[PDB]
Structure 1
C-alpha cells in the first residue's frame, strides 16, 4: 500500500480540491504525442503514481483538463495530452497515451524537470474521453501492469475488452447520442469478466457529461479520485468510496463487480 493524505470523506472528495498544492507545466518536447500539460503535487510525502488522459476525436486538452488538478491535489502526477492529429483513432490514441506515461517517467529522471524522483513509475493509470476512452481500454488490455483505468463516455470499433484485468471504472452519460450507452459503454462494461469494474451512468448526461465544466464535478470527481486512490495506491481507506453504489438522483444506473469492501 501507498497511503498518502488524510482519511477521505464523501464531502472532502466532492470538493474541488484535495489536500495537496498543484503546480503544472507545458511539456517542452513531447515524445510520441502532440502536446502535454503535467500536473503534480509539491506536498505529497512519498512517490505518487502517474495518470495519462486523452481527449476525443477533434478535441484537445480543454475537454479533459479539470481532471489534472482534481487528481493531482489528491497525490498523483497527471499528464493531459493533445494527440499528434485531432483525427487520430483509438489505437493511435492508446499508443500516444502510453508515450505520455513514458515521457512522465523520463521527466521523473530529469534533474531539471519539476517532477524528478516524484513518481513510482510502477504505479500508472489511464483515462480519457470517447475515442480517448476506447484508447484507455486498449492501453489497459495491452498493458495489464497498469493499476487503474477510468474512461468516460468510451467509444471503440470493438466492444470486446474481455482480456482486461486492470480495475476499470466506466463513466457513462445516459442520453449520449454520439457513443450511445446501449451500443458502447454498457457492452464494453459487460465484456469484462476478469477484473474489478464499475459502471456509473450520469442521469440526463450528454456525451460531454464528464468533461471540464460538467454539472456533476462533485460526484464524478469523487468517484475518479476514489477509484484511482483505491487501485493505484492499494489504499483500502478508499474501498468504501470506490465500491459504493451512490444514493444520488444524479446517477441513472450503477453496476459493479469484484469491488471488495
Structure 2
C-alpha cells in the first residue's frame, strides 16, 4: 500500500468540494521569520491517518497573502499543510519569490510551531504561486529539484527557458490575460519544460489575470489532484488528470500523460 494516501477514495464531486474530509486550523507567522515576510499556515487537525506533505503559496507583484487566502482551507482540508506567504516586499521579482518560497518551506521543517511540525512530512514539499509568484514556482524548482510538485498560476517571468526542470509542473493559464499573456509567458514556459517531464497545461476559457485570486472550482479540483498525485504519490487521483480533463471551463488542456 501507499503510506501517503489520506482521506476516502475520491470522486469528481469530492475534488470539486469547497471543503474536504479534514478539519482545518491555522497558525500565524510574523514577518520576523527568516527569508520571507511571514504568512498563514493552514493544516489538517486530525492526526489518525499520519502526517501530511506541504505546499508553499506565493502571491504576485504588488500583492499580499490575502489574494491567495482562498486556497488555504479548501486545499488543506483535502490533506495538506498550506502556507500562504507574504514576500519581503511587494515589488519582489520572480527569482526572489522563488527563494522566499524555499525559505518558507524550510521554516515549516525547522522552526514552525509544534502543532504544525508534528503533522508535517518534511520529505514531501511543493510550491505554488500567482503571476510573478508563479514565475517564482518555476524558479524554486530549479533551485531545489527535490521538490515534489510545482503549480505556476498565470505565471510571469522574463526568463522563458525551463529545460532543466525535474519537478512535476502544472501550469494554469488565463485565456484573456493581458498582464502575463499566455502567448508570451505560460505557453513558452510549458513548451520549454522537458517533454519527458510529468507536466500539464490548462488554459481557462475567457479568464482574466486575476482569476487565480477568485475561488474557481476548475482551478481547485485539478490543483488538488496534482498535489495528491505528486506530493502523496496517490494514484487514486490519476483518474482526474489522465485522460485530459474536458471541463467546459477549459479552453485548452495538454499533458504528458501517462504519469508512470
TM-score of the two chains, using structure 2 as the length reference: 0.94
TM-score of the two chains, using structure 1 as the length reference: 0.94
Alpha-carbon contact 1:30-1:36 (below 8 Å) kept:
no
Q: 1 CA distance for matches of 2:128 and 2:259?
A: 22
Give every structure 1 segment of 4 or more consecutive aligned residues whose post-TM-superposition deviation is greater than 3 Å: none
1:228 paired with 2:227, answer yes
Q: Which residue matches 1:210? A: 212
Deviation at 1:218, TM superposition (A): 1.5
1:73 paired with 2:77, answer yes
Alpha-carbon contact 1:47-1:120 (below 8 Å) kept:
yes
Describe the SS at the equivalent of 2:103.
helix
Q: 2 CA distance for matches of 1:77 and 1:173?
A: 26
Deviation at 1:258, TM superposition (A): 4.3
Number of residue pairs matched by the alignment: 255
Q: Which residue matches 1:188? A: 189
Describe the SS at the equivalent of 1:115.
helix
Q: 1 CA distance for matches of 2:242 and 2:109?
A: 30
Q: Which residue matches 2:88? A: 84
1:22 paired with 2:24, answer yes
Describe the SS at the equivalent of 1:150.
strand
Alpha-carbon contact 1:33-1:83 (below 8 Å) kept:
yes
Q: Which residue matches 1:200? A: 202
Describe the SS at the equivalent of 1:221.
helix
Q: Which residue matches 1:10? A: 12
In structure 2, the gaps of 5 or more residues are none
1:252 paired with 2:256, answer no
Alpha-carbon contact 2:108-2:117 (below 8 Å) kept:
no
Q: 2 CA distance for matches of 1:133 and 1:51?
A: 13
Describe the SS at the equivalent of 2:170.
strand
Q: 1 CA distance for matches of 2:46 and 2:28?
A: 20
1:130 paired with 2:135, answer no
CA shift digits 1:94-140 (9 cap, x unpaired): 111100000111245x4xx3213211100000000011000110101
Q: 1 CA distance for matches of 2:82 and 2:25?
A: 11
CA shift digits 1:214-251 (9 cap, x unpaired): 4xx21111100000000000001011113342222210
CA shift digits 1:183-236 (9 cap, x unpaired): 10000000011410000000001001121x34xx21111100000000000001
Mapping of 1:82-161 within 5 angstroms? Answer: 82-107=86-111, 110=113, 113-161=114-162
**Cα root mean square deviation, aligned:** 1.3
Describe the SS at the equivalent of 1:181.
coil
Q: 2 CA distance for matches of 1:103 and 1:220?
A: 27
Q: 1 CA distance for matches of 2:254 and 2:15?
A: 21
